[PDB]
């Protein structure tokens, strides 16, 4: 459920819409996120999860470390291929419940949308409204 974490004198409220967040306590996630960012300042750590209601393939692995210059379009290609999605079937990414432009880079998305644990969370679905 909704979580509250204190960082730098702020009480951070997180609606916790992520299986990964539910299974990994905030302190552990932020500690790992800090470590990955320090070790690889040029890479973007992404947690990729299927929207619950989406009737398409699930991912076997959620954790991707991608170059900052990888485009959203290239990441679509990778995810689509990994879940064996036919070309006739739609796939949408959501970051903070908004579909990012295919032309955006993963570094841009990280800078605009990374969470208080230093991970970027992307959900995906077969439909353009998240659910």
Residue numbers in the entry: 1 to 131
Authors' account:
Mammals conserve multiple mammalian Atg8-family proteins (mATG8s) consisting of GABARAP (GABA type A receptor-associated protein) and MAP1LC3/LC3 (microtubule associated protein 1 light chain 3) subfamilies that tightly bind to autophagic membranes in a membrane-anchored form. These proteins are crucial for selective autophagy and recruit proteins bearing LC3-interacting region (LIR) motifs. Many mATG8-interacting proteins contain canonical LIR motifs that have a basic hydrophobic LIR motif with a core consensus sequence of (W/F/Y)-X-X-(L/I/V), which binds to the W- and L-sites conserved in mATG8 proteins using the amino acids W/F/Y and L/I/V, respectively. In this study, we identified LIR motifs specific to the membrane-anchored form of each mATG8 and characterized the residues critical for their selective interaction using cell-based assays and structural analyses.
